[PDB]
Amino acid sequence: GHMNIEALTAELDGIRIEDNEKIVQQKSRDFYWYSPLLKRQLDHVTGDLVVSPKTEAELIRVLKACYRHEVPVTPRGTGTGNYGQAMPLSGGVVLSLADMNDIREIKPGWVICGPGVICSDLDKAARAHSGQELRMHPSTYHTATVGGFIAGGSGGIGSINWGGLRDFGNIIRLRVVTMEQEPQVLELTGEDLHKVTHAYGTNGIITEIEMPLAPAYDWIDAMVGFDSFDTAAAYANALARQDGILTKLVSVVAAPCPFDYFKRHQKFLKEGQSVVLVMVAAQSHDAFKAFSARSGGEIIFDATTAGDLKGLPPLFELSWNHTTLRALRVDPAWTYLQVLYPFPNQLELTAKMDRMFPGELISHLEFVRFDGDITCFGLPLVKFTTDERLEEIMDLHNANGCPIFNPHRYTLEEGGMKQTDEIQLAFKREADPKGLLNPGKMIAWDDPDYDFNSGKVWLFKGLKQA
Amino acid sequence: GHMNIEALTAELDGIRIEDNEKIVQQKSRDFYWYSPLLKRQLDHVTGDLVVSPKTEAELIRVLKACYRHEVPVTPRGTGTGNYGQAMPLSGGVVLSLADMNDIREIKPGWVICGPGVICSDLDKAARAHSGQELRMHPSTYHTATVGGFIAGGSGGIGSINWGGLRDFGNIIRLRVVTMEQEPQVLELTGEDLHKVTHAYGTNGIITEIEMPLAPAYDWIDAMVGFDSFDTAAAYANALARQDGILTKLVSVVAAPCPFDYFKRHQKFLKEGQSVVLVMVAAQSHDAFKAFSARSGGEIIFDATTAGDLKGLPPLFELSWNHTTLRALRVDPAWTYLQVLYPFPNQLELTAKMDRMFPGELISHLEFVRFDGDITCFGLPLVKFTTDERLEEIMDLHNANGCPIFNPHRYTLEEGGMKQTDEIQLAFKREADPKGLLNPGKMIAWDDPDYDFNSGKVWLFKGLKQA
Ligand SMILES: Cc1cc2nc3c(=O)[nH]c(=O)nc-3n(C[C@H](O)[C@H](O)[C@H](O)COP(=O)(O)OP(=O)(O)OC[C@H]3O[C@@H](n4cnc5c(N)ncnc54)[C@H](O)[C@@H]3O)c2cc1C
Ligand SMILES: Cc1cc2nc3c(=O)[nH]c(=O)nc-3n(C[C@H](O)[C@H](O)[C@H](O)COP(=O)(O)OP(=O)(O)OC[C@H]3O[C@@H](n4cnc5c(N)ncnc54)[C@H](O)[C@@H]3O)c2cc1C
Structure with missing residues (x-):
């Protein structure tokens, strides 16, 4: 129970918030219990408040209030992850992006949408518009959000053709809002957007996605x-x-x-x-x-x-x-x-x-x-x-030569997918200087003695080159 | 063979024929001259007339008459091949498919058209209709026919994505008319169509093609x-x-x-x-x-x-x-x-x-x-x-480990792409029992002693196995 909840709530009039204990608990859990270890280790985790901004302006108002009251913020799409990614280890705000579900552009080969769009709804729109669909989607197609797929997922149906979210080209641009005294808008293209992929929301809130589209076949x-x-x-x-x-x-x-x-x-x-x-x-x-x-x-x-x-x-x-x-x-x-x-x-x-x-x-x-x-x-x-x-x-x-990405872990580094390097650490300081975004999910942020240069095979290799 | 050009011509009233020597000479040549050896060997090749059917029924009239009057038939799209494939080694009819260029159906993921359609024209129609295009095309895009690509080509632009015409799925169906006393119509699907691919027109005339389509992008x-x-x-x-x-x-x-x-x-x-x-x-x-x-x-x-x-x-x-x-x-x-x-x-x-x-x-x-x-x-x-x-x-x-497909040859077997096996030989015997279709292009037809089981790396491997 974070000490500043009363003051934070008073600054959020007009924004949809929920403090009912049972609902907060449900919205503080994903499908972590697929892992017996996580089911035990994360059993006591719950937030203090679920906050549901409808627009980027509302989101900025929420982040600004959480920053000044130093209340942790853990983003959530629809909570279908398996590693506890959207689960708030420090209590605080569960920030649901589910109402930010705009779809603003569909063109030959790409779409621009909000983070809360459910994958199957994105395809429904792209098919009606011009017979197009996502290149890839998780098997949770009908329940998972696009923003949560980018921040918490890796690939799935369609990876046979396109590889995964680790690969250049499978995401075109990410618009991200920082956790700063005055939240900043970053338009990440090129290699820069790859700092955010599979980072569990620890380095900014995705508010707009540009992803490629593929043809919708029978x-x-x-x-x-x-x-x-x-x-x-x-x-x-x-x-x-x-x-x-x-x-x-x-x-x-x-x-x-x-x-x-x-x-x-x-x-x-x-x-x-x-x-x-x-x-x-x-x-x-x-x-x-x-x-x-x-x-x-x-x-x-x-x-x-x-x-x-x-x-x-x-x-x-x-x-x-x-x-x-x-x-x-x-x-x-x-x-x-x-x-x-x-x-x-x-x-x-x-x-x-x-x-x-x-x-x-x-x-x-x-x-x-x-x-x-x-x-x-x-x-x-x-x-x-x-x-x-x-x-x-x-x-x-x-x-025996078969690299494991350990799903019985809840941190980025121990999960074997998102490598921490100096660029990842510098970017978290740029986007979250107070460490209020999904705390506890990045070991290297909490432990300056942790050797992040170990780990052999990383699915999402860092940007730093030799 | 007992060729009777006059009797052939008399049976083709209503079908467009050209006997002008200069025009016939031009339409008896391709780009063989890119090879100095072929330029010398094929310099004296010319047909006796060019016959240009507009419908499959006219084509059937032509083949039926050529079978009866023993006039060789060498198919031609637009004559952009590089190995002399469309060049009539025995004189006779150059059978131009240039006027069998209908576009019949365009659906999501597939097209049905005639063999004479120029690749760029097919794409212009598929783009206007539903934003689609061929998966692959030769660099002679603006001049080459789709039928000639299938019968005499192998791949090109787009092979980076899809492989080659050698591969399952890059052609869906080939409608083929045989050179028999009563020409037969075959609808070749599955593995059967791969008897005709890169066969230089030696085992039937393609009269309709069903090929997949791909998305047209910028x-x-x-x-x-x-x-x-x-x-x-x-x-x-x-x-x-x-x-x-x-x-x-x-x-x-x-x-x-x-x-x-x-x-x-x-x-x-x-x-x-x-x-x-x-x-x-x-x-x-x-x-x-x-x-x-x-x-x-x-x-x-x-x-x-x-x-x-x-x-x-x-x-x-x-x-x-x-x-x-x-x-x-x-x-x-x-x-x-x-x-x-x-x-x-x-x-x-x-x-x-x-x-x-x-x-x-x-x-x-x-x-x-x-x-x-x-x-x-x-x-x-x-x-x-x-x-x-x-x-x-x-x-x-x-x-030194780099297989050659010799372009300085005009036969199927010596060019290294289309392997002769017992299945290929049997199919020509079925589809062209008199050996009137593009004679001289398949060595194994003329050579009973030909060890067609030699050769190492064949681009278009035969259908026979085990
Ligand atoms: C049965 C089942 C099958 C699955 N199959 C697949 C599969 O094939 N492929 C696959 O990759 N995954 C799969 N998953 C995992 C998960 O369903 C997907 O990755 C899904 O797309 C995650 O999206 P979500 O909206 O549920 O995200 P959540 O679980 O809500 O969140 C995931 C992560 O993203 C963060 N986040 C969410 N929204 C934002 C935002 N706007 N900005 C910043 N950070 C944000 C959260 O903080 C969290 O770290 C599966 C899960 C289940 C239960
Ligand atoms: C500059 C240049 C670049 C080229 N680049 C490529 C390339 O990238 N890829 C490639 O594969 N080729 C390439 N080629 C070769 C050629 O252009 C293509 O293969 C082309 O698609 C052949 O089509 P065509 O209509 O010109 O056929 P033609 O030359 O007229 O005939 C080719 C063969 O097909 C047979 N044939 C034609 N129509 C039929 C039919 N309806 N039924 C049965 N048999 C038939 C002919 O008898 C002949 O054996 C290139 C040639 C040149 C000169």
């Missing part, structure tokens, strides 16, 4: 079935390398996950079958069938031949961390890892990890472009037993 | 200048690997070719400078600038800053075999090779060839997707001296 859901995980992974790798077959998703989900946890599609599945989830553009569908017939890929579900699709979720809601959701809804002991299998050894590495952890781990791959190669990331399911065994499983992945 | 021309070929190639490889920076062309042209032969752009160039030719989508242009600043790439020409300049060719008319056009326009002694530098060793290999042939060869790379990797093909310029030295340069490329 994407056809298909599942390809296999009697082993290795054969499924080999097929998915080969399909992902078909440069003329346009896909939006290529996932591998190892048995027993599909038959056990993909309940609505169960009529298309059988016990022991691993599956490859595919979204294929209608103009590439015939070639996909011809390639699959040549490549030993049995199509066990095709949205164009399956008949009545009523009640079936889109295959993307069986992919990415939706795969984890489907498993933990049936058995809550399942958690997950985040893994890279570096090119060109991804088939051998995924198989080795699969064999190393029988029963305890269920393999799950997502094929993506990564540094110009086609490879796969992993979201393997892990049956939680003890904290120590979970750390050991992750240590073993790292020691 | 493509920005830019040139990036370097003081050495190797640094230009390293930059271009890195740019090609930026998965979020959407490009349509990434070419490397070694000094002294740009300064000597890119005359209209001379004010932007300097002596000694190698160049990377880039087409970057407007929504990726700012990211391209930021990447270039971080990657040692000096932008020496940029269409967004150059102004509305008339008389400047698009950069793609300095790329692919337009680079060769420009060189031989100034010095007719230049010819070219076609090379693959196999992934992942393309930088090592291109440098080794560049240094092995100083002065006599000028390096030229085109970066493309190939089998799922990003690598480059080569169109190096070679100063012609003797036939023996030209053969030797190609032998040395092959012996």
Whole structure:
């Protein structure tokens, strides 16, 4: 309970605020509980107030009042993150951007919108306007905001074509408001916007996004079935390398996950079958069938031949961390890892990890472009037993050439994605000199003795060059 | 064969025919003369008449009459091939498809049209209709037909994104009419259409094409200048690997070719400078600038800053075999090779060839997707001296890990792209039992002893396996 809440509230007349304990608690939590460790470590976290600005002017009024009363501010889109990113470690204000949902420009190849736009609503507008859609979106498409995807996410559906938010070009411009005595507006383009990507809101509030757009095609859901995980992974790798077959998703989900946890599609599945989830553009569908017939890929579900699709979720809601959701809804002991299998050894590495952890781990791959190669990331399911065994499983992945981005952590550095360097530290001081933006999420800000120059493989490498 | 030209002509009343010697001679030649060897070997080739059907029904009348009166038929789009593909080795009919140029359907992601449509005309229509365009096109964009591209070409602008016509999905369907007593209409989909791709019209006439479409963007021309070929190639490889920076062309042209032969752009160039030719989508242009600043790439020409300049060719008319056009326009002694530098060793290999042939060869790379990797093909310029030295340069490329697709040959097999296998031979026997379609272009048809299972690296691999 921050000491200055009464005075801060008195300065916010006319701005929508909420101090009801139950609502504040709900809006102080994301999906951190996918991690048993975070579920325990973050159980006591709650804010003091939820503040919901409608416009950038209201946001500036809120930040100015929080700065002068030194009340921490933790941004929130819609709170669908998995690492506790939007959770206020120091209490204070949960700053919801959900009402800043303008969509102000759609052009051939790009869109300009506010941070609170839900991904699926952005696509609804871009499709109606000119048959366009986002290049990539999280499997939380229907619930997650664009601003929270940029500040807290990394990629997802469409990464097979475009890579991820780590890559130049997948975001065009970020307009950011600083936490200063007089909040400043920064228009970040070029490499500068990459200081903000996956920074958990610690270096400014995104108030406008310019992102590229891609063509909205008739994407056809298909599942390809296999009697082993290795054969499924080999097929998915080969399909992902078909440069003329346009896909939006290529996932591998190892048995027993599909038959056990993909309940609505169960009529298309059988016990022991691993599956490859595919979204294929209608103009590439015939070639996909011809390639699959040549490549030993049995199509066990095709949205164009399956008949009545009523009640079936889109295959993307069986992919990415939706795969984890489907498993933990049936058995809550399942958690997950985040893994890279570096090119060109991804088939051998995924198989080795699969064999190393029988029963305890269920393999799950997502094929993506990564540094110009086609490879796969992993979201393997892990049956939680003890904290120590979970750390050991992750240590073993790292020691066997499969870098881990630890999702059982709530800080930037320990999560393995957003590298801290001198430029990141200088920018946080520029955008948040008092350290009021999402405190506790950046270890190097709190600890001048912390060695931020360790950590091997970073998904979002820092800007500083050699 | 018992050719009867008079009886053929009598059966074609109502169909446009040309027998003027000068016109027939012109329409019996392509750009074979880019090769000094082909210029000498094919100098005396001419047809007997040009027949120009306007409908598939007229085409069927022509083939039926040519079968009966044993008149060879050599298809022609607009005759921009480089290997003599459309040249009638046995005289007879030059079958022009230039008037089978209807545009039938444009939908999200696909087009249906006739073989005679010029690539730029197809794009002009698809852009006006729904902001779409071809995935790929040859540098002869404004002159070449789509049907001739499929039957005689391989890739080009856009291959950086989509691979080649060799790849599943870059063509959807080919409607083909056979040379049988009653010509048969085949609708080729799946793998079957790949029997006709790059077959030089030897196994049927394409009468309708269904190909995918891609989004039309504001493509920005830019040139990036370097003081050495190797640094230009390293930059271009890195740019090609930026998965979020959407490009349509990434070419490397070694000094002294740009300064000597890119005359209209001379004010932007300097002596000694190698160049990377880039087409970057407007929504990726700012990211391209930021990447270039971080990657040692000096932008020496940029269409967004150059102004509305008339008389400047698009950069793609300095790329692919337009680079060769420009060189031989100034010095007719230049010819070219076609090379693959196999992934992942393309930088090592291109440098080794560049240094092995100083002065006599000028390096030229085109970066493309190939089998799922990003690598480059080569169109190096070679100063012609003797036939023996030209053969030797190609032998040395092959012996140093750089497969040659020999452009100084006019047969399918000797050009290294279209492999003959038992499936290809059987299909010509089905579609052209009398051997009247483009005779002399397929060695295995005339040579029973031909070991068509030799050769190493084929660009268009046969359909047969296991
Ligand atoms: C089932 C499931 C599947 C998922 N699949 C994916 C996936 O495929 N890919 C993926 O990347 N993620 C995935 N996620 C994670 C998450 O859903 C997405 O990253 C999502 O886009 C986050 O947006 P949000 O609005 O929920 O952000 P929140 O959770 O509200 O916030 C995320 C972070 O962004 C910050 N933030 C939010 N808005 C702003 C702003 N305007 N300015 C500055 N900082 C801000 C918050 O402080 C926090 O640090 C998944 C989660 C679940 C539960
Ligand atoms: C300067 C220059 C640059 C070039 N750049 C490229 C490049 O980047 N990429 C590339 O791939 N090529 C390139 N080429 C080669 C050529 O321009 C293209 O391949 C072009 O698309 C061929 O089409 P066309 O209509 O000119 O065919 P033509 O030359 O008329 O014919 C080509 C072949 O197709 C056959 N054919 C034509 N129409 C049909 C039909 N309807 N049915 C069956 N067979 C048919 C002909 O018999 C012949 O075998 C270039 C050539 C030049 C001179």
